[PDB]
Symmetry: D2
């Protein structure tokens, strides 16, 4: 038998190692409330409150800011606008899988498209695991992969750190 | 029914979330040679050649610098002297599991003990995954956990990136 | 009398503290050659070779890549295209002052305009100082100002560390 | 004839470029009160309240936590005990110069000695400048000098950002 843990389900075009950039971040925290974490990740109106690299949001076809399957929305991060659509949403009692495709309105070498996935789950003895991974395609993604320091890595780490702090 | 990936086997005292600091890094790379990666991770004399934060090493009871089960050694990283011993070593055709316990010769609140694990494996379509995770205990671990940027996260990311570059 | 050092001359519009973001980085290095540093900063063809956050460059009306007063150009950084124009260029035997205004082609809340200045000078006993400061205006600059970690600060530090490494 | 700004007075043994690590950080903020900044920097009991990376403080010969010339004290940063002594203190109506030498209780290769200087000053049009620079000697300083992201640079920027936010 194998020693394994739950992993993200990637659509074929976003498989890590098959795109231009891949970033992975993960925290495992004792005493963290699963439901609060889920709530603070899904309801996008909280992001600006705990993750300072993000700003305004807009849900185009909803009267609330809660992400569910197929939610079409936009948000600001690192000062620029990201258009997005939820492509995966499955919430069970001990695990949440949530992922959105993101893109900008640029053309040619400035176009950037991404698939940002999340997996939140309860583990033994009152621990919560938050895994977030992003696969990116386009010329700017090639530049981000070479950046020093790794801006995406630190940015996503700050998202995780803020979500944890805000959920206690 | 579950979607999972191979995961590190933690001894009980080191379980993520039960210690003072947990860091997790991962890369997934297309066309990377699995045997070269294994060679450059196992032979510690290569570390200083591709990972700038590592320094001198010494194997106390071996006439070579190749890590295997129970290897007792020391090395410098981030200017700190780490005493270590390999506590896990399992190498197969498609996967390597390697981990060492590390500690310093300090006492009281200056003491720091860590368990640094690695999982290298071949994935489908000519991809190699390198997962490294570290669990730390002691007062100095509590200070590292608060760093922003996260010092260990960026260090380990650089170790991974160097290991990849060096193995092409 | 005062103890002072040479400082950047700012147009009124860009005065630090009067805009939306201000970034300051500085290195002072022993045994570094002034002329070589100026060459590697002014000749933008070197940027990509030592500063990994920068990509392709283009001079619109020069048959070379040497920045001089009023040089109009564009360069890629953090994956985005920056249009620019040199607004200050004064090179003496022991001090260089160089600055450009930069902007993107975006509209509304995505529009960003910056003034990035540099001061390279010889100091007593074979040391060279490299000071770089940038003032930014626009809604994205307000976001960059609160970013965690500070993206601009770390990127510019990488520019300086690279310039130094490449000039040694 | 020269365009200059006030600069820190370094004792000879700490001159930037002549030691193992030099870090420079600076903010310039509109509407910040000079006296408030001076208060929140000199009264080391506020450090904990606005800068999360600093720990306990202790004053060896004073019944108060206000730093002045020759003030002997110790503090914790990065989970490290640093014995310090103020070696510079000059407070005028529009400029403060404050600096301390710090050291640890270690021998040979683990020994670290630093000189951390500050310059707070009023600038034209209701702006306040806060400049902080640190020069470090010893083997651990050599390691810090190689960190990417630069650990000292990011910690000091956080100190400055906290100081500003708290004094607003």
């Amino acid at each position: 038998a194998m020693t394994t843990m739950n992993a993200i389900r990637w659509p074929k075009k976003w498989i890590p190692g098959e795109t231009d950039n891949f970033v992975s971040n993960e925290v495992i925290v004792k005493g963290l409330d699963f439901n609060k974490v889920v709530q603070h990740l899904r309801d996008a109106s909280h992001w600006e409150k705990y993750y300072k690299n993000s700003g305004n949001i807009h849900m185009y076809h909803q009267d609330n800011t809660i992400l569910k399957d197929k939610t079409r929305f936009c948000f600001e991060t690192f000062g620029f606008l990201v258009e997005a659509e939820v492509e995966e949403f499955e919430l069970k009692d001990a695990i949440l899988r949530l992922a959105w495709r993101g893109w900008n309105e640029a053309k040619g070498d400035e176009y950037l498209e991404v698939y940002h996935a999340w997996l939140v789950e309860k583990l033994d003895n009152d621990r919560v695991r938050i895994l977030t991974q992003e696969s990116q395609s386009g010329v700017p993604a090639k530049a981000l992969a070479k950046s020093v320091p790794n801006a995406m890595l630190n940015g996503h780490q700050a998202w995780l750190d803020g979500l944890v702090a805000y959920s206690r």
